[PDB]
Amino acid sequence: MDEEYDVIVLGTGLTECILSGIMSVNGKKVLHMDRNPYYGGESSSITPLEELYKRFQLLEGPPETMGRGRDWNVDLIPKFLMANGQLVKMLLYTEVTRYLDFKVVEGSFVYKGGKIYKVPSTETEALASNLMGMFEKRRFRKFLVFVANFDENDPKTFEGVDPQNTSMRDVYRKFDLGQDVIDFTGHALALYRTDDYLDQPCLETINRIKLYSESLARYGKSPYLYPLYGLGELPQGFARLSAIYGGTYMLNKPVDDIIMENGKVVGVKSEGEVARCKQLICDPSYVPDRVRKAGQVIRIICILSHPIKNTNDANSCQIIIPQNQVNRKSDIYVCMISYAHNVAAQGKYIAIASTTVETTDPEKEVEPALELLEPIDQKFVAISDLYEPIDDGSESQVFCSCSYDATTHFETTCNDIKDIYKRMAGSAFD
């Protein structure tokens, strides 16, 4: 290593790679290291099918029926991007989009009463939905038109509501929408994880639903994007971006100690060598004593030889199960991709079910979701601990990221990246 760098990054997970790229684009001299022999950290991709069976201690290799092992690219933590979301804008800023190929996710579904239904975001879809009865549908149709016309710059578009004071609960009441419609609207449209929004000003929720509608994409597909060949393409594209700027990426390089003493600040020692830096970015595994355990998530990867039933034979999809429909305090998510996004062999599908652990039998908690996929060829169970920083980085200049939660989209990951950028640069990412 060189004698000095502006920033040193430890770990090649999604958050770190994105932050690294922004820094290089901003004119910083960066060193990026990882102790592992591969890219991705916790959010890595298993490139050959044989290896996945190995990582899960299954001595019997892949059966004949799974096809060509090289044609599989299994992400361990799959997540979709909202087309007009902020993460995509971060990708545009750096220009890594010059190396990625995005393909739209075919469908978006929600669970209600034991069955899955398409998520309606337009007036036409509302009127066609099997989710609601004749009269409620109509009321739902009014709701969407209200959201579609809302313009915070024109007080006439409000409907006697004060965007900054009227709660969303009052808005649901104004249209007389029942509990079941609220479950799917808050959770599958606005994309909240909890019901805390109910007692907060309505404005935010209005803009969130607007975002879903606007992210549209023709044919009536969905507002989600997923890269061809999977998420593994991101670490690859960024590494290529650093080379343009004269940045340095280094794999299989252990970190012996994070140098820092009095006013904290930093420096890093690897294989005897020491490199100086002004700021440091890292994931939790590099600073066990500056982190606290926030819980656990279960993720079960299922290999299927058939599309999920009750979807119109979708080649990829997002399915959300609100906590309330299954008597839980946390939602269950299921996302599926297949050979259509080039991550599985011809005719094969990959469905990943996830949620936050609440009981002493984590595998039982996911039964609701697994039932939807039933004839399952092979199952791979994985439990992870979640960590969050104790230190914000003010003073110390050590900026640690959070573990990836159970959600199947990038909202919370994007929030973390923005928070860290703010703490680092001392201003908001504009």
UniProtKB/Swiss-Prot annotation:
A single Gene Ontology biological process assigned to it is:
protein transport
What cellular component GO annotations does this protein have?
cytosol; Golgi apparatus
Care to name a GO molecular-function term for this sequence? GTPase activator activity
Q: Which residues carry this modification: Phosphoserine?
A: 427
Q: Where's it mainly located?
A: cytoplasm
Q: Where in the cell is it found?
A: Cytoplasm; Golgi apparatus, trans-Golgi network
Asked if the keyword DNA repair belongs to this entry, the reply reads no
Looking at the record's lineage, which domain of life comes first? Answer: Eukaryota
Q: Which InterPro entries match?
A: FAD/NAD-bd_sf, GDP_dissociation_inhibitor, RabGDI
UniProt keyword terms in alphabetical order: Cytoplasm, Golgi apparatus, GTPase activation, Phosphoprotein
* Quaternary assembly: Interacts with RHOH. Interacts with the non-phosphorylated forms of RAB1A, RAB3A, RAB5A, RAB5B, RAB5C, RAB8A, RAB8B, RAB10, RAB12, RAB35, and RAB43. Interacts with RAB3A.
Q: What does this protein do?
A: Regulates the GDP/GTP exchange reaction of most Rab proteins by inhibiting the dissociation of GDP from them, and the subsequent binding of GTP to them. Promotes the dissociation of GDP-bound Rab proteins from the membrane and inhibits their activation. Promotes the dissociation of RAB1A, RAB3A, RAB5A and RAB10 from membranes.
Family label: Belongs to the Rab GDI family.
List the PANTHER family: RAB GDP DISSOCIATION INHIBITOR ALPHA (PTHR11787:SF3), RAB GDP-DISSOCIATION INHIBITOR (PTHR11787)
This one is known as Rab GDP dissociation inhibitor alpha
Species whose genome carries this gene: Bos taurus (Bovine)
What taxonomic classification does the UniProt entry list for its organism?
Answer: Eukaryota, Metazoa, Chordata, Craniata, Vertebrata
